[PDB]
């Protein structure tokens, strides 16, 4: 789909920007009833650990963290907060660092359109969920980065 | 390969169409692992600066801008947007004008078929990338033009 300020070497995504540049990566295919979950492993939290993991609609901005703009939702590692439309997060989970993994998926049942029940996980354990007024099958896995040294591994085949 | 509504004098390509005619140029050879990058220098943005630079499959339409139709991808100078299959662009980079140069290449590593990691540059600096579900070695350098006065220089031997 597309990415800016992020180097992609296989399943490894590394921040690659200068002074205040936000890096964003959007997967090619949306989640489905079958492949309804993905995980991101933090290899290095970098200077600020500002890694964001979530779902975004098609055509989402490539220079803004997922969750910051409308119809998108994400779990941010640096504060453990859930972002879903604005740059003000909501207390959600605990902060994540190098070694932790963040997961995001859609409840199979919601794949009956008219609503998407999205859940997040930290190291395989569910943190919390949210239901979006938007329809599923139109949500794409996305990762955001914002500081030097940040690096993760994308696992589109994650289970549990 | 072929071109319409574009005059070719050596490495110089100049728009040459009347009222609303789209000019398109497709190079003879596809990019390779070795020669995996090319640049286009804008000599004159013309009336609308609607110059497009990218990769297209063989047999691509000679009267549509690269990026507008399926399995093609391009960076459009007039809006800095990335087009990859439809006539609706996606925020990508900054607009380009007379004096700027646009580059496009494929990551050497992707030349292992089954996927093409395409990157774009503006004045030698990377703007962003996208991975296409299509295979490489089947992607041809292409330039599109659409307004009077538009002129560029094709640099198939560009490096960096």
Q: In this structure, what CATH number is given to the domain that contains residue A28?
A: 2.60.120.920
Chain B positions touching A1 (Cβ under 8 A) are 130-131
Cα–Cα dist A143/B93, whole Å: 19
From the CA atom positions of chain B, what is the Rg in Å?
14
Cβ contact, residue pair B82, A2, below 8 Å: yes
Q: What is the DSSP letter of B90?
A: B
Range of the domain at B62: 1-160
Residue B9 has which token pair?
């004098």
Q: How many other C-beta atoms can be found within 10 angstroms of the C-beta atom of residue B138?
A: 15
Cβ contact, residue pair A2, B91, below 8 Å: no
- CB–CB contacts below 8 A, A to B: 30
Cα–Cα dist B141/A4, whole Å: 22
The beta-carbon neighbor of A3 closest among B109, B129, B133 is: B129
The beta-carbon neighbor of A62 closest among B92, B117, B133 is: B92
Which residue do the tokens 């890694």 mark?
A51
Q: Could you tell me if A107 and A127 are in contact, meaning their C-beta atoms sit under 8 angstroms apart? A: no
Cβ contact, residue pair B128, A28, below 8 Å: no
Structurally, chain A folds into a number of domains equal to 1
Chain B positions touching A144 (Cβ under 8 A) are none
Cα–Cα dist B37/B104, whole Å: 6
Contacts of A17 by beta carbon, 8 Å cutoff, 6+ apart = A5, A23, A145, A146, A148
The beta-carbon neighbor of B90 closest among A9, A28, A59 is: A59
Contacts of B9 by beta carbon, 8 Å cutoff, 6+ apart = none
Q: What is the DSSP letter of B63?
A: T
Helix, strand or coil for residue B108?
helix
Give the gap in angstroms from C-alpha B8 to the nearest C-alpha of chain A: 32
The beta-carbon neighbor of B128 closest among A3, A9, A59 is: A3
Chain A positions touching B91 (Cβ under 8 A) are 61-63
Cα–Cα dist A56/A109, whole Å: 19
Cα–Cα dist A33/A18, whole Å: 38
SS3 sequence, chain A?
Answer: CEEECEEEECCEEEECCCCCCCEEEECCCCCCCCCCEEEEEEEEECCCCCCEEEEECCCCCCCCCCCCCCCCEEEECCCCCEECCCCCCECCCCCCCCCCEEEEEECHHHHCCCCEEEEEEECCEEEEEEEECCCCCCCEEEEEECCCCEEEEEECCCCC
Q: Which value in Å is the resolution of this experimental model?
A: 2.0
Task: Characterize the bridge pairing of strands B150-155 and B12-15.
Answer: antiparallel
Give the gap in angstroms from C-alpha B65 to the nearest C-alpha of chain A: 20
Residues found in chain B: 160
Bridge partners (DSSP) of residue B11 are: none
């Amino acid at each position: 789909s597309g990415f800016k300020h992020i180097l992609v070497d296989g399943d490894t995504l590394s921040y690659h920007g200068n002074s205040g540049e936000v890096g964003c990566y959007v997967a090619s295919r949306p989640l489905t009833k079958d492949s309804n979950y993905f995980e991101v492993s933090i290899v290095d939290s970098g200077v600020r650990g500002t890694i964001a993991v979530g779902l975004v609609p098609q055509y989402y901005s490539l220079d803004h963290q997922p969750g910051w703009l409308p119809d998108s939702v994400a779990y941010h590692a640096d504060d453990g907060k859930l972002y879903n439309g604005r740059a003000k997060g909501r207390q959600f989970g605990s902060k994540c660092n190098s070694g932790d993994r963040i997961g995001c998926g859609i409840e199979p049942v919601s794949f009956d359109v008219q609503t998407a029940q999205i859940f997040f996980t930290k190291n395989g354990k569910r943190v919390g969920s949210t239901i979006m007024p938007m329809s599923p099958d139109g949500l794409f896995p996305a990762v955001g980065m914002h500081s030097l040294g940040e690096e993760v591994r994308l696992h589109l085949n994650a289970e549990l």
